[PDB]
């Protein structure tokens, strides 16, 4: 599908996530796309917890949704 | 007074800093002192001998390495075009000939030591050494520097640009 | 050659560049053996240990010399004298 990853500065990024693609692979694709390490990112959907070692289908997030990529620190 | 034309029109000046105030161990490893502890002992002010000069607010005694002179080092073929451009732009004889084969031009690139003067009663003499295989000119003093005087070295020209310094021994010429 | 005082400067500079020890091994070792025998008998020394002491000595000793040097300069002369050594030893605060 396609979802939005909203950052802190205010830029909006649109990415494609498959129904059967784990979150770790999505983070790896993001890291190879724009260089932000997975340790510097985590998913938040409308102020709700999302982890890295899981899959989108386990959370059942609707399409065209925005995810609060609340910034992190290296390591 | 906007109705009488005063004289001394042509100037041909480049370093527009002329003011009326002028309110002033082994060999190889001494390179550090050239670039770090060599920017306070000398100020730039209006010379009394001729034009601009390097006045002093500090003191340096005999046998003390002070400054390395660097500039656009070129061969002797460029001397012809360089002198033609000196005549055109109104450029002084900055043909600093370290030897007859290489000359240190100082009209397109040069260091702060472009501000020096000449007189038959100078304060320092020239010297050159070789560090790391490269020949570099560093000056060692023979006396102490007082506060408020200008560096000047004898050009050692064997006996028309006059040398107007006012000294009694001043030969009034580069000779 | 001639002109005494010229060769001294050359020797002192040559040795200032160098960084070797200055005391023959065997005489100093035997002296340390004797001064140890003064305290206790039949002490086996480590060859590394002796060397150790050796270096420290020169360090101490050379410092003393330098001090005496400037003391002679304070007395309007070049040659150093025994009296200057007692001067340095007393003024250092180690008598």
């Amino acid at each position: 599908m396609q979802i939005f990853v909203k950052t802190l500065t205010g830029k909006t990024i649109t990415l494609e996530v498959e129904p059967s693609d784990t979150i770790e692979n999505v983070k790896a694709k993001i890291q190879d796309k724009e260089g932000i390490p997975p340790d510097q990112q985590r998913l938040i959907f409308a102020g709700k917890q999302l982890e890295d070692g899981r899959t989108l289908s386990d959370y059942n997030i609707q399409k065209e949704s925005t995810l609060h990529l609340v910034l992190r620190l290296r390591g | 007074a906007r109705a009488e034309v005063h004289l001394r029109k042509s100037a041909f000046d480049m370093f527009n800093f002329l003011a009326s105030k002028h309110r002033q161990l082994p060999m190889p490893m001494r390179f550090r002192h050239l670039k770090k502890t060599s920017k306070e002992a000398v100020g730039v002010y209006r010379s009394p001998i001729h034009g601009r000069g390097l006045f002093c607010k500090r003191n340096i005694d005999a046998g003390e390495m002070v400054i390395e002179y660097a500039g656009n080092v070129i061969r002797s073929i460029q001397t012809d075009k360089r002198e033609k451009y000196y005549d055109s732009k109104g450029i002084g004889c900055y043909m600093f000939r370290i030897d007859d084969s290489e000359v240190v031009d100082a009209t397109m690139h040069g260091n702060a030591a472009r501000f020096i003067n000449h007189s038959c009663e100078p304060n320092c003499y020239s010297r050159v050494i070789n560090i790391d295989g490269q020949k570099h000119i560093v000056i060692f003093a023979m006396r102490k520097i007082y506060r408020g005087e200008e560096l000047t070295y004898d050009y050692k020209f064997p006996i028309k640009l006059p040398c107007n310094c006012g000294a009694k021994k001043c030969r009034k010429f580069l000779n | 050659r001639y002109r005494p005082g010229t060769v001294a400067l050359r020797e002192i500079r040559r040795y200032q560049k160098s960084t070797e020890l200055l005391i023959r091994k065997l005489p100093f070792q035997r002296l340390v053996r004797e001064i140890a025998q003064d305290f206790k008998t039949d002490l086996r020394f480590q060859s590394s240990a002796v060397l150790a002491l050796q270096e420290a000595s020169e360090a101490y000793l050379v410092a003393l010399f330098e001090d005496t040097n400037l003391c002679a300069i304070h007395a309007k002369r070049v040659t150093i004298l025994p009296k200057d050594i007692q001067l340095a030893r007393r003024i250092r605060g180690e008598r």
């Binding site: - | 082994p26 190889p28 | 400067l9 200032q16 560049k17 960084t19 270096e55 300069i73």
Partner: protein, 106 residues
Amino acid sequence: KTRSSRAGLQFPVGRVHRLLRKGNYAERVGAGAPVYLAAVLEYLTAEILELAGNAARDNKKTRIIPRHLQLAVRNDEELNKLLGRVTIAQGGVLPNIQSVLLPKKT
């Protein structure tokens, strides 16, 4: 899992904490003490070794002999203030001749 990489330093931190714990300097220590000590030792070692390398490349020799360390420690002034009463094995002494003892003639 390691602990030195948590701050990005190079000197070990677990070793420092163990050695300070068995060093009976006190009975109970905090968490920032070992990392802080590792950091300050890092800074001092870097400060000394940079001058060591500069002196090594002075004489164009790859290996750093202790003479280079002696020169680098002595020529600096803050080190001489901090390394006051300390010598160096095989260190030697920096060249020095008194000013008034310099003969000359015409």
